[PDB]
Amino acid sequence: VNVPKTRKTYCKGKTCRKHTQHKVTQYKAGKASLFAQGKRRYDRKQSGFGGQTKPVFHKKAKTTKKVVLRLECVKCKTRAQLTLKRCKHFELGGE
Amino acid sequence: MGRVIRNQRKGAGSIFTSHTRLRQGAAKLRTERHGYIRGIVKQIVHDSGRGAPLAKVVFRDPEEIFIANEGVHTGQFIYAGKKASLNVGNVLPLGSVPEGTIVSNVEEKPGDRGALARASGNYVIIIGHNPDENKTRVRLPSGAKKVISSDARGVIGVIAGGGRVDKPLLKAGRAFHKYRLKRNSWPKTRGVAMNPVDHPHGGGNHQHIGKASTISRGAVSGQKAGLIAARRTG
């Protein structure tokens, strides 16, 4: 809900410490397919017929994920530090 | 759910004609190339296949065809390729006229002739034209086919006219329709048959309920109804 791209949120790393303006994007996703142990074993059925696994998965959602705020300085040289704002829906800096 | 009728029969089960109660059998004989004689003594009355089958020639040292509406209980059943055309005879449809009409007639050469063997239905040879070696034949059906040059041929309308132009007045006579073939009669107006019974599926206030066309290719059991169709009403 209007965040402001980069703002001196003290922080560290370290090999730095103190403050440091951090270009702060929010976090995205990441494919896995055919690497995940989750897979390495979850490839089954067992096997002339199957089903899945106890948690798969139709429950009842919440209609509000979370902002994966990903603050990250440039002088501290590292390291893209995650934070957690919770309240949806919203969006970056307006304002 | 049980195994709905249709599914039910087919296999030996308990149904299969009068396979030991009739006369001989179809048979336009075997195959030489230039006419042999045929004195056709007596026309038979069999069962099932109404329309007299009549037993004939026996010449090369001493067969029983289905006989087009033409028996002189001794009739001129001379047949074989080079052979005076006529009601009777049977010449290789590769040497007919153009608008004739053979009854018994063999898909593929030789192999005794069944195409339009039934009561009456004849097979007007309408075509002959486009022919390196074949024939544009009609068919009792209503569709067309190019049979193959020299292939038997009745030569005349199959006997037994309106075997059923009408009118089976009474539930009997079905006294026959059977004592003939299978036990096809009576026939249990399915949609009384209960849920588990056949596929129909009575249900409370009657109802053929949902659908009725029946996709060709369903599970021999999902089957039945109106096969798989291209239409409906009158």
């Binding site: 791209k5 270009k23 702060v24 990250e72 440039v74 | -």
Partner: protein
Amino acid sequence: ITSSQVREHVKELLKYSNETKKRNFLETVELQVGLKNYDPQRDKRFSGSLKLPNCPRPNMSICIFGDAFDVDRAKSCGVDAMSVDDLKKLNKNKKLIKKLSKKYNAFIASEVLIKQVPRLLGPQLSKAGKFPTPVSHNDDLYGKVTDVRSTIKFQLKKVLCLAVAVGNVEMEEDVLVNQILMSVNFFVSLLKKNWQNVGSLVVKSSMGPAFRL
């Protein structure tokens, strides 16, 4: 291709010509690139010059309009029209929203939409060449049209577009290609990760080509 050959597009490519000696009149070089290729809306730019340094080169009529007061926001200068009785019929669609937001530069108008911009006015125009950018739209479209006319720097928005410069005729090499880079800032890089985001481009001056990659 961000390699040694940059000064082959610059140093070795600074006196190619196509005839005899090398003429007798002034020069004219630069360093081609773009704006961000994003979509001229969400994210692609901010603030900070390179330079760079330039202006038009040819025409500058861009985009600025909204109400009956947006016309005078394009009178003592020259821009496109959004119309009044058109945002409810035909002020946007494909060749429409284009018209007003489809020039060359980008856009320098203000804001006023309501529940209509997910597939019409504000919408259909973005990556086309405009979708409500930062042109200090409050006093008008001239002072912030220093970011939309001259000086510059090199406001790079809408569809590609930008600028570059360093010297005149011949006196640059490592700082010629490294002057082309210098002729690039919030257009070659920026905040969180931005050292590169494209595939290729072009450049020269007037001679012949630059990088042969």
